[PDB]
Amino acid sequence: AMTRKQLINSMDMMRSACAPKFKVSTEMLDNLRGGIFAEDRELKCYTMCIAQMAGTMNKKGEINVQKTLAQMDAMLPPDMRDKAKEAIHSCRDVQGRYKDSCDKTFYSTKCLAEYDRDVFLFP
Numbered sequence: 372a373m374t375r376k377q378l379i380n381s382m383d384m385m386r387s388a389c390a391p392k393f394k395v396s397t398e399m400l401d402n403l404r405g406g407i408f409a410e411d412r413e414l415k416c417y418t419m420c421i422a423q424m425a426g427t428m429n430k431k432g433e434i435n436v437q438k439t440l441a442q443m444d445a446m447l448p449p450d451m452r453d454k455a456k457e458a459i460h461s462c463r464d465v466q467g468r469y470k471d472s473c474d475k476t477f478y479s480t481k482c483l484a485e486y487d488r489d490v491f492l493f494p
């Protein structure tokens with residue numbers, strides 16, 4: 372799996388690909404990585420772009436939870452891995468409450484952060 376430094380480098384590259392498509396500032400993006408979620412549609416759709424870049428958005432506009440779990444297994448350092456997977460399982464039905472795909476990814480991500488803020492990270 373990646374080290375935490377490598378994981379951050381990977382997340383930074385995903386941010387650098389997706390952030391230009393949305394009216395999202397460093398304050399908004401750093402806050403999001405830190406588990407603070409501005410209620411801003413541009414930030415919600417940024418989270419969907421990140422899920423799309425990870426290849427975890429199906430073409431129906433839903434989150435592929437099994438693919439997300441397989442990525443965390445492969446990529447996350449062990450102090451993060453089992454906790455991230457338990458968070459993902461816990462939050463797997465949040466997306467069913469939202470019609471809009473940017474809502475699905477934003478609120479699913481916020482569920483992961485609330486599950487354990489010390490483990491949580493996001494691009």
Ligand SMILES: Cc1ccc(C(C)C)cc1O
Pocket residue numbers: 378381382421422425427439442443446447494
């Ligand atoms: C949404 C999302 C962000 C980062 C990663 C990797 C960098 C662990 C996977 C993923 O599915």
Ligand SMILES: Cc1ccc(C(C)C)cc1O
Pocket residue numbers: 422434435436439458459460462463464465476478479480482483
């Ligand atoms: C179940 C579930 C999958 C992916 C994500 C994020 C990583 C997009 C959150 C979540 O709660």
Ligand code: NA
Pocket residue numbers: 453454457458
């Ligand atoms: Na856990």
